[PDB]
RNA sequence: ACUGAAACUGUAGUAGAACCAAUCGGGGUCGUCAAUA
């Protein structure tokens, strides 16, 4: 057996039947480089290029804010509607 | 217990060399035609 390691799992619970449903992310490496101004290149391939990896557009994820109740009241005191403020 | 910043995938390189749209040919010249009764 080779042990699990990356990826996420779906819900489950005591009598599913089913595995877990999984999740990938995708990512993509870029690539970029500097000009060097005078001769107009990238001075090199070592120094002159360098690469991101990035998670693509399109790819939607959850987190969760949480507060106490002492905060939601005094939030909910001076907006009602402050749930509407947090999409951004 | 707090998103790093900032950085042009650019720089040089002629889709080109070679190959005949060509070879042969007098603008010429003479015997009939038709099938029945």
Known sequence: LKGER???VGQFEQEQ???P??????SELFTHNTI???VQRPTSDVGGVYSYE????G???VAELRLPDSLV??????????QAQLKA
Do not use: P
Not at 21 to 26: A, E
Not at 54 to 57: E, G, K, L, N
């Open 6 to 8: 990356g990826g996420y």
């Open 17 to 19: 039947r089913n595995l």
């Open 21 to 26: 449903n999984t999740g990938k992310i995708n």
């Open 36 to 38: 060097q101004d005078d």
């Open 54 to 57: 990035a998670i693509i557009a």
């Open 59 to 61: 790819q939607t994820f």
């Open 73 to 82: 009241k005094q939030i909910t005191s001076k907006n009602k509607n402050w």
